[PDB]
């Protein structure tokens, strides 16, 4: 009975939210927790 | 109606092989996942709550008004599963919705 | 010049306003792209137009006759409008270094400083 | 096919005319756009 699983948090934190919004090339990667989140090293980076 | 929408959205993502909607953000920006679904009349049960049950002074939740909006189903989908900041355009087309 | 919509994020308060519309200013700044100069775009436009007229004359030589002249000139126009679109209308649509807002203003040679008035939803509520 | 040939010609001319990383990126991107 767990086909629907609600999300408790967004993939970004509240401190990282505007940076994700303002970076069109920002993407999530597998995180420790094992979920998909945005990492500060992948936002507004040259790679 | 929101429960039917949530279950259908989850099952449609499963039918697409996407078990975690956040996997979409490994390919696209959060601003690139849209929701363009709608209804002809929306949450008619909340309409009953605010137009008849409140008239009879029966207990109705204080935010019943928001549950009636036709875009509230899409809002709940985004707030529970998708978490995108992409386009949201809710059509209202009666039976051609 | 621009018209956009955006949702915010995961949450539990339906009437809560959010920052999702901020994505109209999204722009990668890790590293002056020629695209942001109208002179270069106009130059490319003239070049493509020349190539288009060459295509037109070749196809006219290869080319009932009324129908077909109609068709060839029509394809010529189709190609000119495509070039115009590419170099003047949505030159920035594929550039991650140009925000949709900046590009909408740049379509007419306007900078971000040329946006003088902001009409606010201003509902007189503390959060909004 | 004809337009693709013309596109590659434009690409090579613009590469000859053409920091360098940024610009190669840009030129190939305009090629794709075309």
Swiss-Prot record, chain C:
Family: Belongs to the thiolase-like superfamily. Fungal fatty acid synthetase subunit alpha family.
Organism: Saccharomyces cerevisiae (strain ATCC 204508 / S288c) (Baker's yeast)
Record PTM: 4'-phosphopantetheine is transferred from CoA to a specific serine of the Acyl carrier domain by the C-terminal PPT domain. This modification is essential for activity because fatty acids are bound in thioester linkage to the sulfhydryl of the prosthetic group.
Further comment: Present with 17000 molecules/cell in log phase SD medium.
Origin organism lineage: Eukaryota, Fungi, Dikarya, Ascomycota, Saccharomycotina
Full protein name: Fatty acid synthase subunit alpha
Positions where Phosphoserine occurs in the chain: 33
Active site: 121
Role noted for this protein: Fatty acid synthetase catalyzes the formation of long-chain fatty acids from acetyl-CoA, malonyl-CoA and NADPH. The alpha subunit contains domains for: acyl carrier protein, 3-oxoacyl-[acyl-carrier-protein] reductase, and 3-oxoacyl-[acyl-carrier-protein] synthase. This subunit coordinates the binding of the six beta subunits to the enzyme complex.
Section covered of the full-length record: 1405 to 1549 of 1887
SUBUNIT field: [Alpha(6)beta(6)] hexamers of two multifunctional subunits (alpha and beta).
Disulfide partners: none
Gene behind the chain: FAS2
UniProtKB/Swiss-Prot annotation, chain D:
PTM characteristics: 4'-phosphopantetheine is transferred from CoA to a specific serine of the Acyl carrier domain by the C-terminal PPT domain. This modification is essential for activity because fatty acids are bound in thioester linkage to the sulfhydryl of the prosthetic group.
Other comments on record: Present with 17000 molecules/cell in log phase SD medium.
Cited function: Fatty acid synthetase catalyzes the formation of long-chain fatty acids from acetyl-CoA, malonyl-CoA and NADPH. The alpha subunit contains domains for: acyl carrier protein, 3-oxoacyl-[acyl-carrier-protein] reductase, and 3-oxoacyl-[acyl-carrier-protein] synthase. This subunit coordinates the binding of the six beta subunits to the enzyme complex.
Family, per entry: Belongs to the thiolase-like superfamily. Fungal fatty acid synthetase subunit alpha family.
Subunit architecture: [Alpha(6)beta(6)] hexamers of two multifunctional subunits (alpha and beta).
Record-given protein name: Fatty acid synthase subunit alpha
Organism from which the protein derives: Saccharomyces cerevisiae (strain ATCC 204508 / S288c) (Baker's yeast)
Full-sequence portion shown in this chain: 1453 to 1500 of 1887
């Amino acid at each position: 009975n767990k086909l629907f699983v609600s999300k408790e948090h967004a993939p970004y934190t509240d401190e990282l939210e505007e940076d994700v919004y303002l970076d069109p090339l920002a993407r999530v990667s597998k995180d420790k927790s094992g979920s998909l989140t945005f990492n500060s090293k992948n936002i507004q980076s040259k790679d | 109606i929101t429960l039917f929408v949530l279950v259908s959205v989850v099952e449609a993502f499963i039918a697409s092989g996407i078990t975690d909607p956040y996997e979409m953000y490994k390919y696209v920006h959060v601003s690139e996942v849209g929701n363009c679904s709608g209804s002809g009349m929306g949450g008619v049960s909340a309409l009953r709550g605010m137009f008849k049950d409140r008239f009879k002074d029966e207990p109705v939740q204080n935010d019943i008004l928001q549950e009636s909006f036709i875009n509230t189903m899409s809002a709940w989908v985004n707030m529970l599963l998708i978490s995108s900041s992409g386009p949201i355009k809710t059509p209202v087309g009666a039976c051609a919705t | 010049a621009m018209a956009a919509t955006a949702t915010d994020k995961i949450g539990r308060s339906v009437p809560a306003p959010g920052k999702g519309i901020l994505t109209t200013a999204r722009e990668h700044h890790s590293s002056a792209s020629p695209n942001l100069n109208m002179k270069y775009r106009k130059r490319q436009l003239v070049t493509r137009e020349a190539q288009i007229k060459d295509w037109v004359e070749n196809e006219l030589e290869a080319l009932f006759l009324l129908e077909r002249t109609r068709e060839i000139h029509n394809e010529a126009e189709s190609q000119l409008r495509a070039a115009q679109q590419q170099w003047g209308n949505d030159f920035y649509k594929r550039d991650p270094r140009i925000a949709p807002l900046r590009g909408a203003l740049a379509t007419y040679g306007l900078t971000i400083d040329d946006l003088g008035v902001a009409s606010f939803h201003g509902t007189s509520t503390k959060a909004n």
